[PDB]
Amino acid sequence: QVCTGTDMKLRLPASPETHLDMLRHLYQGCQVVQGNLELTYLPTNASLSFLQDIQEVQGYVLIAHNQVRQVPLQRLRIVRGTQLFEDNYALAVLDNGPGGLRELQLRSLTEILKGGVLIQRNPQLCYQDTILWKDIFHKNNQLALTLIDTNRSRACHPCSPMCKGSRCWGESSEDCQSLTRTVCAGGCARCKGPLPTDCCHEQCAAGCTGPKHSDCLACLHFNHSGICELHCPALVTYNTDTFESMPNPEGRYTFGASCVTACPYNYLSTDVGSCTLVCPLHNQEVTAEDGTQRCEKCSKPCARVCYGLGMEHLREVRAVTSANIQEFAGCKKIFGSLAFLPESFDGDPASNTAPLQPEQLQVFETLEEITGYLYISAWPDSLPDLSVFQNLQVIRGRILHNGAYSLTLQGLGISWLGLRSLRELGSGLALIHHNTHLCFVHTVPWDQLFRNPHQALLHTANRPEDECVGEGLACHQLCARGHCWGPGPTQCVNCSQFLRGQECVEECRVLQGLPREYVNARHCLPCHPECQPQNGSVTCFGPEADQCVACAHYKDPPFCVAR
Amino acid sequence: EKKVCQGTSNKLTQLGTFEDHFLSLQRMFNNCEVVLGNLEITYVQRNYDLSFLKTIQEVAGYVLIALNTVERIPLENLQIIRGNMYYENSYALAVLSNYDANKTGLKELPMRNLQEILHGAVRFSNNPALCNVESIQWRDIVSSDFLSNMSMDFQNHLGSCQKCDPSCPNGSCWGAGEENCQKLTKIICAQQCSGRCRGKSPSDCCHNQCAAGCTGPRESDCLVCRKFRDEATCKDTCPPLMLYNPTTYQMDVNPEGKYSFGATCVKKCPRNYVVTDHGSCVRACGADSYEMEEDGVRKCKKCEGPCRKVCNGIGIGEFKDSLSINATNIKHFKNCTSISGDLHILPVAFRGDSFTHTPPLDPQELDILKTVKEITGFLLIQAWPENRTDLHAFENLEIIRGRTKQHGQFSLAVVSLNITSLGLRSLKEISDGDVIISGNKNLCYANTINWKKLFGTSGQKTKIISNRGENSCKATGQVCHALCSPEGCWGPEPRDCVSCRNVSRGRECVDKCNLLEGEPREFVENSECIQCHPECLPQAMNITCTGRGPDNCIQCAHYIDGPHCVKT
Amino acid sequence: ECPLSHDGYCLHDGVCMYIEALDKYACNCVVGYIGERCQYRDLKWWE
Ligand SMILES: *[C@@H]1O[C@H](CO)[C@@H](O[C@@H]2O[C@H](CO)[C@@H](O)[C@H](O[C@@H]3O[C@H](CO)[C@@H](O)[C@H](O[C@H]4O[C@H](CO)[C@@H](O)[C@H](O)[C@@H]4O)[C@@H]3O)[C@H]2NC(C)=O)[C@H](O)[C@H]1NC(C)=O
Ligand SMILES: *[C@@H]1O[C@H](CO)[C@@H](O[C@@H]2O[C@H](CO)[C@@H](O)[C@H](O)[C@H]2NC(C)=O)[C@H](O)[C@H]1NC(C)=O
Ligand SMILES: *[C@@H]1O[C@H](CO)[C@@H](O)[C@H](O)[C@H]1NC(C)=O
Ligand SMILES: *[C@@H]1O[C@H](CO)[C@@H](O)[C@H](O)[C@H]1NC(C)=O
């Protein structure tokens, strides 16, 4: 029920046919949004049934350029606003508009911690100006920015007469806003009614149901096991009797705005019990042999480690050019992401930026792990696959392109992928669109690459089935269950036979063949060539030549040497 | 400024007569507010005054009022009882059998400002005459966790007691005068916050870490803290040094972050405590650790490999109740280098114990204490055999950190011994604590130590008096030493001067290491002439060895390999 | 006063006492010591 949220400020979607499908695969079943609740460029007849349970948004809520009649966010409870759209805005409803937003229907929304409201350029909405925004806002941001559109170009009905105050979001009777701040008495921050007895706990944020702290509507700082307060229980208990430190059994790990038992994959844990995406300085990401990772303190120098895009060394640049190709010299783990923009292969005059070459990508050969996303939008006509990323093992995806994607391919001349050793896609999605030559798009085992239920392939506008059957675009039968990458037999992810040099072969040359190879549990490896070939028997057993029953020329006690 | 009061751990023990114990109680608890130990009020007679108990504000242990005779114990300004130490494993406030043969003991106990007890319970027993204590409800004081084990009784018979104050709710008054009733802060209070409060208003209750009420919703207007005490405020956890930064995405300096030294948060740990990565001043680190300094201050890191053995010492860990080292626990100190605790050499180990059924300590086992090197806490030596002349069991005692101190002040106490010289040949630094040498019979060489260059922490005295006398070691059997500095000498043997001026070869000091008329030739290095390379031929009235290495000689012994003097 | 099961329980010539008001076994130290079993010397003063 935890999703990471997108990062589309105002840009156009990369694929309009799979954008609603992207929101369906991500925002379904979410209740706590770690990032941003963004709804950009949604046309009419859009099934928005995946939005009926989102409650907590840690960043801003954007509804931009949409043509839907209504946005069902009636269960939206709290907008924390840790990341804001503009400098001082947290609820931005822009440029929506027969189309256009009819009613907002934000019933349970009664708390915004940081940020303001920007409702602008929406000539289909009625009740954006009659909402008391001081009831929703916190005490610290009472002087917030409350820019509300005035022109509506549609005269509609007033509010429902069953509730007083004329504070309604739409036309329904159960839709009008209940005051939680301007109805309280004394110094109550949030309350249910005007009585001082019905005031809420000081750690409740969006109201409460009872006076206790375990039944808030939304909580202010940190939640664990239904109990929420300011300070999260850490893993270190400091006993002030004999002045000692103890591991706390009841300490929970800080995850976003909550405290969980163990925070999931692609969230690196620290010593203070506050897991997040990246670790600070003097810390190395190590593996705790359990599928998860937990960075601790490193040694004394800790000088050099490989960084990438979206990090300390590279902030403003978006693509990999020849200026930042020396920094990836032979590193096996890029901290950050990789993006190949179409401007990276273009020569810009008066800038001394040389375009890339196909012989320059061989520095990415020893790459095995990417902590961010992999974005490719331009590819030369030299080689039609991704053999320069063939040793890439895992893509973590802690930094995502547009907050949603971790493996993006935009308009390439690629025909088969060729990502052989790719075995784990951590976070995000996988978008493939407008590739008119890529046939092998559904033969990849994407379900074996996934680790979260919010992950799915989004493919469109690729090479169809009719151009892949008559043209012979189908690999060998060695790839088990159709899990295939390219037409060669060397790119099966899991074949039921042995391996001769990262290539699935049918039968090892043990009883036959001019060289002799020994049999591994999954591989098939060549041993020393001067072992005597046994005509109809098991010849070789190990890499050292002493384990042969007979050798060629000389018999010495260590091994068999030719001279 | 909340002056530190040490407390007493001498439960139900009369110290001498009644007058001597009363003078010790008046001398111990004179003008002290926060009691880190235990408030034990025992054996106070009728015609005495207890005004010095008016200044005690809070106690960090149990409060044991037992076997008294005075009619009034003014514990008026006592605010909170922490209850860190338990009396009967669940009890903190124990008033136990305060009655004479006339059954007229403690008539009233005016605990006016007492509003909350965190840990422990309340036990009242055998109080015939006791006014305005039976009407006090204890649901306001004792929390809901430790409410089950408490029990009390009241038998008022022929006490001639008057009426409580009707101007206070629920009839609960501590005394008999005006505004002498219980300032209850729990039940006439809204349940809209889990902390305390000051009135019946719902939106006017205290902070979560403000225990025993407050004077406002801000954490500065607060009487006492609950877990940690920040400067004039109360916090649950004062923040570390380097937090996150949303701008530079790196580590940022502290706006208000400090360390954690016990109940308070200070800016810097002392030089002997271990600075952990979480920013808390600790005495001992974790069980899988390695105490080693990184940059000046002492730290602990995760040890690799075997991580063989650490010694808990006396007082903490497994040996918390054992009061001295003896013939039973010394076998755990065999392969031990760093004492992470205390060391008590008491006369119970040499006389034998009939209660705990332990054999007497073999005096030859004290050489096992030769193996250890340092003490984090304190050293209390009150026993030594009559035949051995010097304390040679602590020859390799390098540093005493003084983390745990005897009565909160003393760190090195070699008292009531039969020694003629201390013999601490490697004691070079005492990081914390006071040093007393007193009560000894024939121990000189004590005023010629000059302890001011031994400790580095300022504000520390020493107490050396009535040991031997300056005119007693005047004879030829006792002298400090010649040829060395008068800074310090530990014994009559020449290996006992602290700072030798001329020659400091090993542990001993001599006339001179001979560069002209000696077969070993030792080059001077930092006023410590040590033996040079053994394959160097001694010269005739010349400088033989210049420095450390085979390339510092003129004529080699056997063979010449360039500048080196090699055997083969 | 106290029986032979608590003989030697108290140190430094402090006499054993039996408090019948609480059914406890206690010490009476000589002038100069401190503790539960009269096991510590008062270090804040002489000797
Ligand atoms: C010599 O050194 C001995 C240490 O090795 C030391 O022995 C200790 O004597 C103490 C005297 O009371 C004991 O408290 C201490 O630990 C005890 O071990 C018992 C083993 O069964 C436990 O049953 C016992 O538990 C309870 O004991 C009493 C009962 O009233 C409580 O007061 C106590 O709090 C606890 O609830 C306790 O754990 C013991 N240690 C060892 C390791 O044996 C001996 O006294 C020394 N002799 C001297 C100084 O003369
Ligand atoms: C605080 O955390 C608790 C614990 O997870 C939340 O309780 C869950 O609420 C959802 C509502 O959709 C239920 O489906 C779960 O079954 C609940 N879990 C448990 C263990 O009860 C709670 O919603 C969080 N927020 C607040 C404001 O209390
Ligand atoms: C207690 O302290 C006060 C402080 O002035 C002093 O006058 C008094 O003599 C002290 N009493 C004892 C017994 O030390
Ligand atoms: C005191 O109450 C606790 C409940 O927390 C219980 O576990 C314990 O047995 C009780 N008795 C004691 C400490 O003697």
Residue numbers in the entry:
A (entry chain B): 24 to 120, 134 to 599
B (entry chain A): 27 to 594
C (entry chain C): 5 to 51
Authors' account:
The proteins in the human epidermal growth factor receptor (HER or ErbB) family are some of the most thoroughly studied receptor tyrosine kinases. Ligand-induced homo- or hetero-dimerization of HER proteins initiates a downstream phosphorylation signaling cascade, which stimulates cell growth, proliferation, and differentiation. HER2 is unique within the HER family in that it does not have known ligands and cannot assemble into ligand-dependent homodimers. Thus, to facilitate downstream signaling, it must either form heterodimers with other HER proteins once their specific ligands have bound or self-assemble into ligand-independent homodimer under the condition of overexpression.
Finally, the complex structures of the EGF-bound EGFR/HER2 and homodimeric EGFR ectodomains were refined to 3.3 Å and 3.8 Å resolution, respectively. The EGFR–EGF/HER2 dimer adopted a heart-shaped structure, similar to the dimer structures of other family members. EGF wedged into the cleft between Domains I and III of EGFR, stabilizing it in the extended conformation and exposing the dimerization interface of Domain II. Accordingly, Domain II of EGFR resembled the canonical bent conformation seen in other dimer structures. On the other side of the complex, HER2 retained the same conformation as in its monomer form or in complex with HER3, consistent with its ligand-independent manner for signal transduction. Since Domain II of HER2 was presented in the unbent conformation, it dimerized with EGFR in an asymmetric manner, consistent with that of the NRG1β-bound HER2/HER3, EREG-bound human EGFR, and Spitz-bound Drosophila EGFR complexes. Specifically, for the EGFR/HER2 complex, both the N- and C-terminal regions of Domain II interacted more closely with their counterparts relative to the EGFR homodimer, burying 884 Å2 and 412 Å2 surface areas, respectively. Strikingly, the DAs of EGFR and HER2 adopted different conformations. The DA of HER2 was inserted properly into its binding pocket on EGFR and made extensive polar and nonpolar interactions, whereas the tip region of the EGFR DA was almost dissociated from HER2, maintaining little contact with Domain III. As a result, the total BSA between the DAs was only 1395 Å2 in the EGFR/HER2 complex (910 Å2 on the HER2 DA side and 485 Å2 on the EGFR DA side), which is less than that of the EGFR homodimer (1769 Å2).
